[PDB]
């Protein structure tokens, strides 16, 4: 099941100058386009080999549209500052996300200072406000019938162009790298650490209540890593086994020291 997402972040910076606005697009866990207001030449630019080939119209429209997004969220930063009656010297963050999943479900959500603000429901015909301030934006969105404009994109363009990208980058987007695994022994009792290396996508299930589990991390080459540890009494090592569940592997393997 594949998906395409677009994200944006507007971070106000009093004194420092104008609000920063960054946006990017993803297909599954792979970034293909990026935009940063700080760049010397703010414009949407390729991040994945399979879309740089697109003609100059594409980049001209993507860039022109994305610049309009920056200006809008900059304007929103001040609108929301009013709703919450906030100082003009504090920094605030307005995050946006949109995407389509293969069409099974669409979405569009906004977040202010880390908390949910406004979200489009699954039905793509209604909104959900997180607080009283968001209720204003909700009524403004309902009275403006913008939902139709949003579902049109999610049902058409989003899905339409998603198929296009999924074919152009077939080598990169439809390939899963299995995890390289092994167990290590660390005498303290003793600690058993289970490793999963060089895998893709990032989703993975590692299991041994008292087990330490670190968030999955990027290796830096495009693959990910993750390990799980457990302190066990000497000689009781053999009673423990590590379970690794990953999409690349046909079935989930079980490891033991």
């Amino acid at each position: 099941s594949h998906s395409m997402r677009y994200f944006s972040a507007a971070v106000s910076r009093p004194g420092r100058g104008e609000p920063r606005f960054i946006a990017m697009g993803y297909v599954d866990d792979t970034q293909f386009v990026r935009f940063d207001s700080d760049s010397a030449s703010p414009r949407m630019e390729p991040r994945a080999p399979w879309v740089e080939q697109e003609g100059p119209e594409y980049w001209e429209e993507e860039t022109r549209n994305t610049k309009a997004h920056a200006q809008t969220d900059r304007m929103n930063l001040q609108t929301l500052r009013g709703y919450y009656n906030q100082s003009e010297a504090s920094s605030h963050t307005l995050q946006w996300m949109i995407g389509c999943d293969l069409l099974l479900r669409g979405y569009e959500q906004y977040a202010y200072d880390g908390k949910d603000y406004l979200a489009l429901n699954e039905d793509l015909r209604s909104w959900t406000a997180a607080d009283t301030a968001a209720q204003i934006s909700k009524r403004k969105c309902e009275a403006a019938n913008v939902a139709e404009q949003r579902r049109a994109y999610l049902e058409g363009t989003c899905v339409e162009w998603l198929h296009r990208y999924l074919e152009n980058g077939k080598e990169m987007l439809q390939r899963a790298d299995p995890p390289k695994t092994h167990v290590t022994h660390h005498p303290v009792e003793a600690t058993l650490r289970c490793w999963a290396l060089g895998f893709y996508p990032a989703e993975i299930i590692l299991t041994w209540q008292d087990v330490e589990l670190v968030e999955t991390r990027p290796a830096g080459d495009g693959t990910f890593q993750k390990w799980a540890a457990v302190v066990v009494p000497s000689g009781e090592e053999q009673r423990y086994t590590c379970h690794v569940q990953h999409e690349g592997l046909p079935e989930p393997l079980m490891l033991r020291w």
């Binding site: 993507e62 549209n65 809008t72 304007m75 609108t79 929301l80 406004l118 404009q149 363009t157 162009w161």
Partner: peptide, 9 residues
């Protein structure tokens, strides 16, 4: 392809 317009909260 990005949606051409951003919402006005």
């Amino acid at each position: 392809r990005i949606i051409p317009r951003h919402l006005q909260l």
